[PDB]
Ligand binder design. Structure first.
Ligand SMILES: *Cc1cc2c(cc1C)nc1c(=O)[nH]c(=O)nc-1n2C[C@H](O)[C@H](O)[C@H](O)COP(=O)(O)OP(=O)(O)OC[C@H]1O[C@@H](n2cnc3c(N)ncnc32)[C@H](O)[C@@H]1O
Ligand SMILES: [Cl-]
Length: 385
C-alpha cells in the first residue's frame, strides 16, 4: 500500500544520480538495489574514476561531459564527501597510429577545449616518471580530472534520502509488470507500483532486460585494476602526475596518480574476461594476466611506478556492440526508461545521465541530445521477443 511517483531499479552510478535529481524536485521516489550502494559488486568501486572532456570515444560526448563536470562541482559543494580532484588527464599514443588520440585532438578543437599538445621527449621532460618513445605524441587536458566514485554515489544517496527518497537495499528485483499507466516490480521482499520506471542495473541489464521483452546484445566483462608502490616524488598527485588514458600497440590503458601514498593505480581497458555478473570471480590475482598485463605496461612506460602490489579490485564493464551507451525510453513503454551498456566509460557522465533519466521519467523527453544513445540504432542490433 505504498505507490511511488517513480521507481529506480538499480541504485548505482546512474540510478542514484537519477534518484537524487528526482528527489530534489519533490518527486516521491523509491530506489531498489540488490546490495547497499556504494558497494564492490557492481561497476563503481575501485575508489577513483577518470573524467575527460575532449573525448576520444567521440566528440559528440563533449556536451554531456562538460555538463557532468559542472554537476560534479555542484556536488562537491553540497556534501562533506570528497568528489573531484583536478589532476588533469594525459592522453598519448604512437604518432599517427591512434584513432583514440586523433579523435581526442579533434574533439578538443571542435569544442575549443583548453589543452596542451606535446610529443616525444617533451612528454618525459614535463612528467618525470613517464618514458614514452620519441615517436609518441600527446594531448594533455589540464582541467579534467579524477572523481571519487564511491563518494559520489554515497553523497547522492545521502542527499536524496534527506529529501525523502527511499532506498530499499539487498533486494533483487526479479520481474516487472508494465501497463499503459503504471509500472510494478517484484522482489523477494515485496512488490511496488509507480507511474514511471527507470532501469539501471549495470552488468545485470544483460540478464534481466529480457524480462521487459528486450533483446539487446550486452556483454559483461571482468576488468581489474591494481595499485602499485611508486616513487612518490614522481607519481603523486601532489607533484602533479596526471590521470591518463593511453593507446599502445597492444591496447588502451588508464591510470591515476598516487593519492596520499596509495600508489599509482592502473587498468588495462581493451581486454577483460567475458563473464556473468552472478558467477564472476571477484578476487584479484586469480588469473595470471590480472597482474602481468599491468606490469607489462608499467615497466615500459612508468617504470618508477612498478613496485609491490598494494591493492587490487575486480569490477565490470557492460559493452554494447558499438560501445556507445543506451539511454532512452523503452520502445514499447513510454513509462519505462532504460540506461545500460556504459561499456566501461560511463561513470564520468553519471551526474549528467541522472539528470537525463530524471527528465525522461518525468516528461518523456530530455533537453540533452541523446540521439547517439538511441535504443533503436542499427549498430546496437536491438530487438523484442
Ligand atoms: C569497472 C570499471 C569501470 C570503469 C573504470 C574502471 C573499472 C575497473 N574506470 C572508469 C573511468 O575511469 N571513467 C569513467 O567514466 N568510467 C569508468 N568505468 C565505467 C563506469 O564505472 C561504468 O560505466 C558505471 O559504473 C556504470 O554504472 P551503472 O549504474 O550502469 O552500474 P553500477 O554502478 O554497477 O550500478 C548498477 C546497480 O544495479 C544493481 N542491481 C543489479 N541487478 C539488480 C536487481 N535485479 N535488482 C536491483 N538492483 C540490481 C546493482 O547492485 C548496482 O548497484
Ligand atoms: Cl560499464
Amino acid at each position: 500500500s505504498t505507490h511511488f511517483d517513480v521507481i529506480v531499479v538499480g541504485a548505482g552510478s546512474m540510478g542514484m544520480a537519477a534518484g537524487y535529481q528526482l528527489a530534489k524536485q519533490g518527486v516521491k521516489t523509491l530506489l531498489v538495489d540488490a546490495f547497499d550502494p556504494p558497494h564492490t559488486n557492481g561497476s563503481h568501486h575501485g575508489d577513483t574514476r577518470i573524467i575527460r572532456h575532449a573525448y576520444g570515444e567521440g566528440r559528440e560526448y563533449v556536451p554531456l561531459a562538460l555538463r557532468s563536470q559542472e554537476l560534479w562541482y555542484e556536488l562537491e559543494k553540497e556534501t562533506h564527501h570528497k568528489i573531484f580532484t583536478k589532476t588533469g588527464v594525459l592522453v598519448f599514443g604512437p604518432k599517427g597510429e591512434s584513432a583514440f588520440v586523433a579523435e581526442t585532438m579533434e574533439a578538443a578543437k571542435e569544442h575549443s577545449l583548453t589543452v596542451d599538445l606535446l610529443e616525444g621527449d617533451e612528454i618525459n621532460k614535463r612528467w618525470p616518471g613517464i618514458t614514452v618513445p620519441e615517436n609518441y605524441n600527446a594531448i594533455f587536458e589540464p582541467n579534467s580530472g579524477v572523481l571519487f566514485s564511491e563518494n559520489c554515489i554515497r553523497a547522492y544517496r545521502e542527499l536524496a534520502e534527506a529529501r525523502g527518497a527511499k532506498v530499499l537495499t539487498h533486494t533483487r528485483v526479479e520481474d516487472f509488470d508494465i501497463s499503459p499507466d503504471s509500472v510494478k516490480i517484484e522482489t523477494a521482499n515485496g512488490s511496488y507500483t509507480a507511474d514511471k520506471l527507470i532501469v539501471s542495473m549495470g552488468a545485470w541489464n544483460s540478464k534481466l532486460l529480457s524480462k521487459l521483452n528486450l533483446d539487446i546484445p550486452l556483454q559483461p566483462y571482468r576488468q581489474v585494476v591494481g595499485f602499485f608502490e611508486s616513487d612518490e616524488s614522481k607519481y603523486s598527485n601532489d607533484i602533479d602526475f596526471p590521470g591518463f588514458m593511453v593507446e599502445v600497440p597492444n591496447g588502451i590503458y588508464y591510470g591515476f596518480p598516487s593519492f596520499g601514498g596509495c600508489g599509482l593505480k592502473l587498468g588495462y581497458h581493451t581486454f577483460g574476461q567475458k563473464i556473468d555478473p552472478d558467477t564472476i570471480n571477484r578476487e584479484f590475482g586469480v588469473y595470471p594476466e590480472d597482474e602481468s598485463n599491468l606490469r607489462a605496461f608499467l615497466e615500459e612506460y612508468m617504470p618508477g611506478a612498478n613496485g609491490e602490489l598494494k591493492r587490487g579490485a575486480v569490477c565490470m564493464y557492460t559493452k554494447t556492440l558499438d560501445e556507445h551507451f543506451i539511454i532512452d525510453l523503452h520502445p514499447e513503454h513510454s513509462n519505462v526508461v532504460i540506461a545500460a551498456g556504459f561499456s566501461g566509460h560511463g561513470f564520468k557522465f553519471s551526474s549528467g545521465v541522472g539528470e537525463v533519466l530524471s527528465q525522461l521519467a518525468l516528461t518523456g523527453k530530455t533537453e540533452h541530445d541523446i540521439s547517439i544513445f538511441s535504443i533503436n540504432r542499427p549498430a546496437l542490433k536491438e530487438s523484442l521477443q
